[model samples]
Target: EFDDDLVDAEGNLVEKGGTYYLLPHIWAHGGGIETAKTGNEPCPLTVVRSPNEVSKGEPIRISSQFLSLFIPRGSLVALGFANPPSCAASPWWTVVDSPQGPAVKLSQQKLPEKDILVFKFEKVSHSNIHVYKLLYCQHDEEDVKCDQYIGIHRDRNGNRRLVVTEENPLELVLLKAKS
Candidate 1:
């Protein structure tokens, strides 16, 4: 058996029959960057995972606070694989299809060996994510167009979207099930 890459509040994996949900963490937890000296609107995206493990070879469906426009299908959405070496206790969140308009799928690629907690997506077969990268970048004009972008952040409030990026990995609280 292999060790899990996700964890809970206490850094514990779900018990065999326990009830739980993926707790957002630093690697995947939502956060903000200092944009202006006064203030920045906010990073609307709060990357959430499923309460179960996602396999590397499977299709995926992502749906957050849907936006005004449905993210163009086949649009490249970066699936960042949190640094497992440092933060192995990364929370496990669940996602599924159905009501799956513009259903999204993610493909994995091996990242360069580094201390990067964020692994930009290499390829995904599909997608359903809505308007993205509004905050990761600043718009010159209200209607300014962005040709180059990655699906990591969004446009929203200052009190909401939260994600975490950690430098050092933390320990996990392991939960064993009946053998």
Candidate 2:
């Protein structure tokens, strides 16, 4: 169970404020290529990954294939990855517990926009993760074979009497707070 404080190129720790990422430890980062033979630049190889390139609210780690890092079990930390294919799961531009509740922690020295979506599975005795073959959306004029259909339309007989289609999926089985 190893962890490094998220930091910028100059070794400054990331603080509260923004939503997500960084090239992964550029606060005068470590690990990357730098040697006595090759003098390290001021802040060499700085990078800022995009949201699609990251997986928020998920446990972060690297498999044994790469010797860069070795993480332990149940190390639940918000994690992300860099732009490189191999190092695509080392970073964790995640959230932390604030006084009130959950809070996002991001680097202020980071690049332009930092916008992303975070999803987590609920402790459900009924529902589970649903795997669907993702594809482009369908037009209203085309067949409505998409997993969930949501649009403005009337029921059968131009009224909510019989049913050819309903507003939402039948077995969606979503989760909710117990009131």
Top model by TM-score, which number?
2
**Winning model by lDDT:** 1
Model 2 TM-score on a 0 to 1 scale: 0.20
lDDT against the true structure, each candidate:
0.23, 0.23
Worst 10 residues of 2 by lDDT: 30-39
Per-candidate RMSD, Å: 18.2, 22.0
lDDT of 1 by residue, 1-179 (tens): 53322232353432322332222223343322211111221321223223223211111222222231322222222232222222222222211122411111111223321212121111112423211121111134642222322222222333221232122221111122223
Give a tens-digit lDDT track for model 2, residues 89-131. 3233323233533222232233321221121111213323321
Candidate 1 yields a Cα-based lDDT of 0.23
lDDT of 1 at 28: 42
